[PDB]
Amino acid sequence: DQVMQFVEPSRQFVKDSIRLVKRCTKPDRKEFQKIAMATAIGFAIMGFIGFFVKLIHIPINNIIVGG
Amino acid sequence: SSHKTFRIKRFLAKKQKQNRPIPQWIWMKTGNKIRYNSKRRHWRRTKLGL
Amino acid sequence: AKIKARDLRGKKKEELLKQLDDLKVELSQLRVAKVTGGAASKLSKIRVVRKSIARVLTVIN
Amino acid sequence: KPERKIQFKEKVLWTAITLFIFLVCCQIPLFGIMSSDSADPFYWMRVILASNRGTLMELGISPIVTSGLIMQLLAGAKIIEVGDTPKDRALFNGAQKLFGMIITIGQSIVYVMTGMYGDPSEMGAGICLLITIQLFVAGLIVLLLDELLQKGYGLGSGISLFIATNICETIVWKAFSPTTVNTGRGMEFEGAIIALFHLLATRTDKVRALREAFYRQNLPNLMNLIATIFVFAVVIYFQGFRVDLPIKSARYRGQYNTYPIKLFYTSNIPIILQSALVSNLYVISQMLSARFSGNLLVSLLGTWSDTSSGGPARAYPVGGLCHYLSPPESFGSVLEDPVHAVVYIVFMLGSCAFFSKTWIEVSGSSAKDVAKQLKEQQMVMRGHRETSMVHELNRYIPTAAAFGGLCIGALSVLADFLGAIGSGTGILLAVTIIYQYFEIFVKE
Amino acid sequence: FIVDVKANKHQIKQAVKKLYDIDVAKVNTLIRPDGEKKAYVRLAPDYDALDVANKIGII
Numbered sequence: 001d002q003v004m005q006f007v008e009p010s011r012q013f014v015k016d017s018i019r020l021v022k023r024c025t026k027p028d029r030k031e032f033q034k035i036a037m038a039t040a041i042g043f044a045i046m047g048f049i050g051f052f053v054k055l056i057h058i059p060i061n062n063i064i065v066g067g
Numbered sequence: 068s069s070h071k072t073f074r075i076k077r078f079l080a081k082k083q084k085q086n087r088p089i090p091q092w093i094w095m096k097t098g099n100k101i102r103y104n105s106k107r108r109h110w111r112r113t114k115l116g117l
Numbered sequence: 118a119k120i121k122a123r124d125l126r127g128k129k130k131e132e133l134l135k136q137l138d139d140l141k142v143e144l145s146q147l148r149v150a151k152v153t154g155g156a157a158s159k160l161s162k163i164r165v166v167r168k169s170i171a172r173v174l175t176v177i178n
Numbered sequence: 179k180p181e182r183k184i185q186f187k188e189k190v191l192w193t194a195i196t197l198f199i200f201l202v203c204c205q206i207p208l209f210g211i212m213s214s215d216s217a218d219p220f221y222w223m224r225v226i227l228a229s230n231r232g233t234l235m236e237l238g239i240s241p242i243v244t245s246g247l248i249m250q251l252l253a254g255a256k257i258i259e260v261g262d263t264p265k266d267r268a269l270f271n272g273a274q275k276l277f278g279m280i281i282t283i284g285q286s287i288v289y290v291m292t293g294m295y296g297d298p299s300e301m302g303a304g305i306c307l308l309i310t311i312q313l314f315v316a317g318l319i320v321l322l323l324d325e326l327l328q329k330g331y332g333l334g335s336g337i338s339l340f341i342a343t344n345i346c347e348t349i350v351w352k353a354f355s356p357t358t359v360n361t362g363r364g365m366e367f368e369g370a371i372i373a374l375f376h377l378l379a380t381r382t383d384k385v386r387a388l389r390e391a392f393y394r395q396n397l398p399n400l401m402n403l404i405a406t407i408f409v410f411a412v413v414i415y416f417q418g419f420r421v422d423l424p425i426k427s428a429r430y431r432g433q434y435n436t437y438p439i440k441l442f443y444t445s446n447i448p449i450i451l452q453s454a455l456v457s458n459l460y461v462i463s464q465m466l467s468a469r470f471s472g473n474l475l476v477s478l479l480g481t482w483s484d485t486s487s488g489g490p491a492r493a494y495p496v497g498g499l500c501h502y503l504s505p506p507e508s509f510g511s512v513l514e515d516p517v518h519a520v521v522y523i524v525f526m527l528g529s530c531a532f533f534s535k536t537w538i539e540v541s542g543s544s545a546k547d548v549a550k551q552l553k554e555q556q557m558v559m560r561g562h563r564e565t566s567m568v569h570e571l572n573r574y575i576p577t578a579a580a581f582g583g584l585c586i587g588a589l590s591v592l593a594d595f596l597g598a599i600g601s602g603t604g605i606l607l608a609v610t611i612i613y614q615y616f617e618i619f620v621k622e
Numbered sequence: 623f624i625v626d627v628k629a630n631k632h633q634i635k636q637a638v639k640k641l642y643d644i645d646v647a648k649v650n651t652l653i654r655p656d657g658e659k660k661a662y663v664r665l666a667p668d669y670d671a672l673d674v675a676n677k678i679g680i681i
């Protein structure tokens with residue numbers, strides 16, 4: 001009936017999707033550590049600039065409250 | 068000739084494989100004196116013996 | 118990561134043949150990956166798998 | 179705006195000085211506002227606009243994030259011709275900033291009617307004009323920087339940078355902040371990590387400290403920070419997934435290259451648009467409901483009430499189909515309202531997947547377009563004609579787009595369920611937004 | 623597939639069956655102008671070639 005044509009898009013979708021997952025290359029463990037460390041140092045530097053930003057937040061709003 | 072023997076076909080295959088030009092990374096090694104492939108054969112000019 | 122002939126000598130024939138079979142299937146996968154387009158890291162491993170197969174066969178013989 | 183010769187260290191220095199131009203506006207509080215009672219049209223809506231409250235840039239990125247759409251829309255019907263000569267070019271960029279002033283005037287109408295800025299009569303027409311003009315100056319430094327960057331002085335696009343230091347900075351504040359809030363139970367700093375250290379001094383009992391460590395609802399929970407790192411890691415592993423396609427030059431021997439098809443073919447557009455549609459459904463429903471109420475249809479779209487959640491009370495879609503689309507507040511809320519809880523997942527996942535699949539064909543990133551590109555770069559695949567190039571690309575491109583949307587939706591849902599710090603939409607924007615910067619830096 | 627010139631059709635069938643635990647309907651072999659043997663392996667109807675190619679790595 002019509003239900004087979006209803007689920008056939010889903011069927012071929014999951015079929016070709018797990019097919020793509022089989023095709024897609026996986027990041028290597030050494031590559032995983034390398035990219036994780038790179039993203040971590042990026043995280044650290046933006047956290048540092050944000051820490052400076054949030055710490056200089058305090059004096060400026062204190063001054064604004066004062067005047 | 069369409070009719071040909073196995074050894075003739077194999078010899079033809081080797082000769083055809085030999086006819087490519089040199090890889091571009093050869094000429095800029097250190098101890099290199101080769102500028103191009105001087106053994107290239109054209110089917111009209113030289114007739115492969117046989 | 119590196120298969121050496123020193124530690125393969127004490128082992129008996131069965132697991133040596135098993136390891137040889139694993140190396141063979143890895144080499145076949147490497148070749149098909151090379152044909153379909155793979156990373157230079159996978160391309161370079163072909164020689165090391167071939168030499169590991171050679172080492173295993175040499176030890177067996 | 180002109181262009182000059184620039185080098186990579188000078189380029190990162192230019193990214194730096196642009197980001198401090200952004201930061202001096204982000205930090206300083208605005209003056210002349212004396213109405214803070216409501217302050218909650220939508221938390222998610224603020225994130226998409228990188229908007230602020232009581233700050234210089236509270237104006238938001240709306241104009242710069244729309245004006246561009248108007249130019250693209252005119253081009254599709256070919257109503258106008260965009261600049262094809264340098265003098266014509268030096269116009270749209272600016273005129274768009276001038277049109278941005280008209281968009282800011284629309285924001286002034288929204289500000290008075292919503293009442294977050296205040297009543298229209300109490301401020302008065304002249305005083306309302308003074309604040310609107312001053313907000314435009316804070317937006318204008320960003321808008322002129324956008325022209326300077328659009329020419330290429332600025333690295334890539336600044337819109338990503340504003341979000342990059344807007345949604346991430348908030349997570350960094352939640353993780354560590356030296357302000358102390360006391361209900362009198364104990365002395366703890368705003369930062370979740372500092373709060374746990376203060377708790378150890380507050381209570382000798384190890385068990386009470388572990389109970390606080392698992393659950394600290396009034397302050398940011400410590401568990402949320404652990405989840406935020408875990409969700410960042412899983413998105414990084416998903417980000418790596420790629421498809422390697424053998425691509426070879428049309429006139430050289432033995433040349434091996436790979437054309438990468440990443441799982442996330444649409445890098446951030448599905449989420450920026452999705453985080454946009456979910457925010458909008460809610461933003462109009464709260465505003466329309468307040469101005470005109472007692473109509474069954476408006477209540478059917480949504481009903482709005484504010485409940486405090488470790489901070490100011492947030493208007494929730496208490497009623498209306500937007501509630502089913504709305505997120506589940508607690509794991510118990512998922513148990514209590516699976517319906518809305520689940521609806522909240524199908525709409526978000528479906529929207530990203532539809533928006534991705536449609537985005538790949540909107541932006542000219544389809545298989546045929548990229549094959550045509552590879553043709554103008556004299557790029558071919560071994561043992562294949564160009565029609566087979568298109569066919570091979572089609573084997574991945576639509577499937578890759580759809581499953582990329584599916585994966586980002588599922589990852590955002592999992593991150594929200596684990597209760598990590600920040601909205602799932604925010605975490606997604608952060609990883610992709612840094613990654614575009616990361617590729618340029620590695621490319622150097 | 624590409625095979626070496628010393629392989630029979632029976633040998634190719636058996637090798638494919640062992641390596642890829644599938645069924646083969648028939649084999650057609652030719653020898654390329656460049657030297658190696660090219661084999662077209664037709665599978666049983668109840669096996670589709672696309673999924674086997676998936677498992678292989680060529681898609």
Ligand SMILES: C=C1CN(S(=O)(=O)c2ccc(C)cc2)CCCN(CC2CCCCC2)CCCN(S(=O)(=O)c2ccc(N(C)C)cc2)C1
Pocket residue numbers: 211217218219220221223224227229230231232236237238240285288289292294295309461
């Ligand atoms: C620009 C907005 C966006 N909006 S919107 O109004 O619906 C709207 C929508 C569409 C357009 C085209 C215009 C306006 C909705 C999101 C509101 N998030 C809620 C935040 C979340 C964190 C905790 C504080 C509250 C704040 C974003 C800034 N806000 S604002 O805080 O409310 C504000 C801004 C300016 C003033 N002044 C003094 C003029 C006062 C208040 C408005």
Ligand SMILES: [Mg+2]
Pocket residue numbers: 111
């Ligand atoms: Mg002659």
